[PDB]
Ligand binder design. Structure first.
Ligand SMILES: OC[C@H]1O[C@@H](O[C@H]2[C@H](O)[C@@H](O)[C@H](O[C@H]3[C@H](O)CNO[C@@H]3CO)O[C@@H]2CO)[C@H](O)[C@@H](O)[C@@H]1O
Length: 300
């Protein structure tokens, strides 16, 4: 129903809109790294998220390093499984080239181009697909103008040769926080969005103001990852600040995916130890974070 109704997504005046020009807000879950917790990514779990949580997007977090795709490329087949499930379930799907320790997206740019060529050839005639070409550029030696923008200007044409207008999300500096510099030096492609990531354990008032600055430059922003925890993915749960961010995102038409769908014993994990990887989770099988995130999506 979601993808049939909204169909082709595009950016109009800095906003994500559907094929009839109406604003639409995606809300869903990210996997954790597919090399570690890939068992939680399957049609049945995604169907349960759709039906019981109300998700309308799923993010497949394919780490490049840390035992991910560069080390063992088999994890690309799990991305394909996720995409196929999203197509069958009629929800959107984010294909996330999940850089992190490999902090400059240029490190594995040749592999990224290859990977996005393959994915856009396979899936470029479905409206479900959103390409996230570099999760979290980071480090003081990685800037928008010097590193990230020219990386994007190599990868985007590879995608566009196969898929001329599905959404592309481009990471920003400082772990996808530096939307200000991106917004001042935007990419040409009209269906690009810039990633912004937050963690509720950080006091967020200035970060909200910087998102507003970026929006005011006509840049579109997708909150392609956020957590209820501290910035490490752990360190307690911060539901008061999370709620402030939830309300902010609703007021600004900002789509989002929460980190993450795993049973790992860290505060950002949505599931308890013993949660079934194919779904069906009782209240007792959701973590503090998962209970909250589920409520936010069901409210929506
Ligand atoms: O258990 C698997 C490995 O986990 C590694 O820690 C990861 C955290 O569990 C995870 O929450 C964190 O997520 C990041 C995400 O990649 C980018 N956005 O920010 C999130 C919060 O920091 O990523 C951690 C690093 O991959 C751990 O380091 C390994 O030892 C484990 O094998």
């Amino acid at each position: 129903s979601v993808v049939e109704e909204h169909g082709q997504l595009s950016i109009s005046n800095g906003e994500l809109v559907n094929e009839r020009g109406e604003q639409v807000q995606l809300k869903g879950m990210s996997s954790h790294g597919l090399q570690w917790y890939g068992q939680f990514v399957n049609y049945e779990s995604m169907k349960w998220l759709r039906d019981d949580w109300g998700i309308n997007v799923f993010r497949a977090a394919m780490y490049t390093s840390s035992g991910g795709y560069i080390d063992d490329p088999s994890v690309k087949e799990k991305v394909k499984e996720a995409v196929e499930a999203a197509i069958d379930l009629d929800i959107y799907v984010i294909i996330d080239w999940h850089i992190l320790s490999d902090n400059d997206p240029n490190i594995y740019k040749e592999e990224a181009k290859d990977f996005f060529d393959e994915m856009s050839e396979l899936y470029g005639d479905y409206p479900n697909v959103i390409y996230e070409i570099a999760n979290e550029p980071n480090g003081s030696d990685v800037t928008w103008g010097n590193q990230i923008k020219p990386y994007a200007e190599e990868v985007i044409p590879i995608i566009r040769n196969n898929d001329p207008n599905n959404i592309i999300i481009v990471g920003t500096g400082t772990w996808s926080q530096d939307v200000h510099h991106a917004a001042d030096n935007q990419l040409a492609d009209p269906n690009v969005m810039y990633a912004f990531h937050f963690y509720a354990g950080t006091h967020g008032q200035n970060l909200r103001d910087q998102v507003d600055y970026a929006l005011d430059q006509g840049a579109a922003i997708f909150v392609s990852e956020w957590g209820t925890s501290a910035a490490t993915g752990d360190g307690g749960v911060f539901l008061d600040e999370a709620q402030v961010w939830i309300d902010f995102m609703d007021e600004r038409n900002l789509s989002w995916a929460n980190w993450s769908l795993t049973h790992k014993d860290e505060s950002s994990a949505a599931l308890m130890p013993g949660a079934n990887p194919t779904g069906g989770w009782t209240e007792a099988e959701l973590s503090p974070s998962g209970t909250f995130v589920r409520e936010k999506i069901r409210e929506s």
